[PDB]
Design a protein around this ligand. Structure first.
Ligand code: IWT
Length: 379
């Protein structure tokens, strides 16, 4: 031991320990139970996690995120060429492999995706070591079910560089199903749908579980749909509102839009547990404050297509698995965006009122299942 589970997420990572028969998800040094998968290079230092995400607006070309979208791929891959068009950092080719290029200590440096991911893993390892005391030797690390062997190996390589013994690489939906004990529940074969809606990715997986054996039946989703898209919709609405009341267009002003997005991200979170949220921005533009409120109903309206549209990958995963929706025995919610009541309602209505597995914090379920698996493997 310790028995450690790591969800190495596209934008946020999570670490858990299995200790005294149960999982404890581990808060980092800022008290956050998830950590940005962000690495920033400055004139003096490397920042990882919250420190890196917190200065991203100040240092966008040297702050790396989404290394998960590059790991294990070739520079020439269509997803690489497409994704690069949307990143503020530079991506280059070395021996046909993508590398991020940054300025660090005043010089140009290049890093393989597994090097950036190892830095994130080192931060997750240190987070576990502050919580536990001593050293962490081994971990189970998760990857998307659709990852190929090159992506799995390059993720393991990030673990190796970090100096972790990688006990197993397991699929993220499998880890979520293990968190809910679905491999020990009830006994026959179970069809399980994992609905994982993150800040920037949406993955639907159908698995069968039988006598403790998992098989991936189908995968579907949208690799560029997440919680940030819902935030975009609220930002547009509220920038329009500020224009209506104060006759000022914040649109050409980067800092004003960024601060509006920060308020919107926070409001969206509150709206998963309250029916309204208050925006309180001091001097948003030309000394004019933006103090206002948004209701949950308005938020659902702004996102009607995006929320309802999550059922199309559900239908496609069923079609590919050759299953009727009535054949799903378990539905598991994963990702912070599944806290949104309207998403839960749409999903539950689609499945004819079936209850959802949602009692585990959905942004922690994957690390939680990875931690149980690690405990099993170290025995
Ligand atoms: S450890 C461990 N579990 N799965 C792997 C793996 C799978 C494919 C390619 C490379 C490593 O490693």
């Amino acid at each position: 031991g310790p028995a450690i589970g790591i969800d190495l997420g596209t934008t946020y990572s999570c670490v858990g320990v299995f200790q005294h028969g149960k999982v404890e998800i581990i808060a980092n040094d800022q008290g956050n139970r998830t950590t940005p998968s962000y690495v920033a290079f400055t004139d003096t230092e490397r920042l990882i996690g919250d420190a890196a995400k917190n200065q991203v607006a100040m240092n966008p070309t040297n702050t790396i995120f989404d290394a998960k979208r590059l790991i294990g791929r070739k520079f020439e891959d269509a997803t690489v060429q497409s994704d690069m068009k949307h990143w503020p950092f530079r991506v280059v080719s070395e021996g046909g492999k993508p590398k991020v290029q940054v300025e660090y200590k005043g010089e140009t440096k290049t890093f393989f995706p597994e090097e950036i991911s190892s830095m994130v893993l080192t931060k997750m390892k240190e987070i576990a070591e502050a919580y536990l005391g001593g050293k962490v030797h081994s971990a189970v690390i998760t990857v998307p079910a659709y990852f190929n062997d090159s992506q799995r190996q390059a993720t393991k390589d990030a673990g190796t560089i970090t100096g972790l013994n990688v006990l197993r690489i397991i699929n993220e939906p499998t880890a979520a199903a293990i968190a809910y004990g679905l491999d020990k529940k009830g006994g026959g074969e179970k069809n399980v749908l994992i609905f994982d809606l993150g800040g920037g990715t949406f993955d639907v997986s159908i698995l069968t579980i039988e006598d403790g054996i998992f098989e991936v039946k189908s995968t579907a989703g949208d690799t560029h749909l997440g919680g940030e898209d819902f935030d975009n919709r609220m930002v547009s609405h509220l920038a329009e509102e500020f224009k209506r009341k104060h006759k000022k267009d914040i649109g050409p002003n980067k800092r004003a839009v960024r601060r509006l997005r920060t308020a919107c991200e926070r409001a969206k979170r509150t709206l998963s547990s309250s029916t309204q949220a208050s925006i309180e921005i001091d001097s948003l533009y030309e000394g004019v404050d933006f103090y206002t409120s948004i209701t949950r109903a308005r938020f659902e309206e702004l996102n009607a297509d995006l929320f309802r549209g999550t059922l199309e990958p559900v239908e496609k995963a069923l079609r590919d698995a050759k299953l009727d929706k009535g054949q799903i025995q378990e539905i598991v919610l994963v990702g912070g965006s599944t806290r949104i009541p309207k998403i839960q309602k749409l999903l539950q209505d689609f499945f004819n009122g079936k209850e959802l597995n949602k009692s585990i914090n959905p942004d922690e379920a994957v690390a939680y299942g990875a931690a149980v698996q690690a405990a099993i493997l170290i025995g």
